[PDB]
Amino acid sequence: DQRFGDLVFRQLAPNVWQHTSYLDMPGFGAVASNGLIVRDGGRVLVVDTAWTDDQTAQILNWIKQEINLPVALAVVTHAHQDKMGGMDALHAAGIATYANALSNQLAPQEGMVAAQHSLTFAANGWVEPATAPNFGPLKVFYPGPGHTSDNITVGIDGTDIAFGGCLIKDSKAKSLGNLGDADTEHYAASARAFGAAFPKASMIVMSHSAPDSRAAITHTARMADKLR
Numbered sequence: 001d002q003r004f005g006d007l008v009f010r011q012l013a014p015n016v017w018q019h020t021s022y023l024d025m026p027g028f029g030a031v032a033s034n035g036l037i038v039r040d041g042g043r044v045l046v047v048d049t050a051w052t053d054d055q056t057a058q059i060l061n062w063i064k065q066e067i068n069l070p071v072a073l074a075v076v077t078h079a080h081q082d083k084m085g086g087m088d089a090l091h092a093a094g095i096a097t098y099a100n101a102l103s104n105q106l107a108p109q110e111g112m113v114a115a116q117h118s119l120t121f122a123a124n125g126w127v128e129p130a131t132a133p134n135f136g137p138l139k140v141f142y143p144g145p146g147h148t149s150d151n152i153t154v155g156i157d158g159t160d161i162a163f164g165g166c167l168i169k170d171s172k173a174k175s176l177g178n179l180g181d182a183d184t185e186h187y188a189a190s191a192r193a194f195g196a197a198f199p200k201a202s203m204i205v206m207s208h209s210a211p212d213s214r215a216a217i218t219h220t221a222r223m224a225d226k227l228r
């Protein structure tokens with residue numbers, strides 16, 4: 001792990017890093033939120049912002065120092081603060097941002113700044129290639145409603161890494177966390193769909209725990225089984 005300001009960065013692969021930011025909440029302590037940084041050729045792709053604009057600006061600052069390649073785009077995985085809280089920092093830097101069309105629709109209602117572009121998805125959950133221009137190794141998949149209705153997931157092609165966001169919890173998790181906006185009926189099936197969408201992926205990255213094995217997916221699905 002590397003510390004940069006109030007943020008932590010961990011290299012997961014030759015071209016993949018995890019960024020970690022924290023938000024303090026009275027009576028619940030500091031909560032970590034993870035996103036991904038991917039170097040693809042002569043450019044950098046980012047998955048999810050940090051909690052805030054200032055923290056997200058630091059991600060860009062870290063990228064400039066450690067990778068020194070222009071950030072081509074960013075993808076945010078749903079309309080909550082830990083994923084889209086720092087959209088302004090991205091837009092201020094002239095970075096093209098992408099989100100589920102539903103996330104952008106929900107964003108103002110959630111007090112979030114919408115992404116500049118909208119992703120749409122086929123009936124099998126895979127992103128419409130026309131909506132995800134120049135995404136490189138990023139394979140975006142909508143597993144169905146779970147943590148939220150708009151939640152999406154990202155696989156990193158050429159690696160053993162898949163990003164489940166807040167949909168997937170680690171194998172040692174006791175709860176599915178914030179179920180405030182959750183679809184308790186479909187959550188389990190959505191978790192399993194994610195696993196099936198990236199079957200060879202052996203490293204599962206998620207929002208609120210260190211990278212885990214595929215057991216995180218199964219364990220999450222089985223916790224969600226008890227919500228039906």
Ligand SMILES: C[C@@H](O)[C@@H](C(=O)O)[C@H]1C[C@H](SCCNC=N)C(C(=O)O)=N1
Pocket residue numbers: 031032080081082083166167176177178207208
């Ligand atoms: C405040 C929102 O951004 C919230 C959300 O996206 O629903 C964040 C924080 C909680 S963390 C709840 C328990 N996890 C503790 N590490 C959470 C989650 O459980 O996935 N996501």
Ligand SMILES: [Zn+2]
Pocket residue numbers: 078080147148166178
């Ligand atoms: Zn969330």
Ligand SMILES: [Zn+2]
Pocket residue numbers: 033080082165166207208
């Ligand atoms: Zn979260």
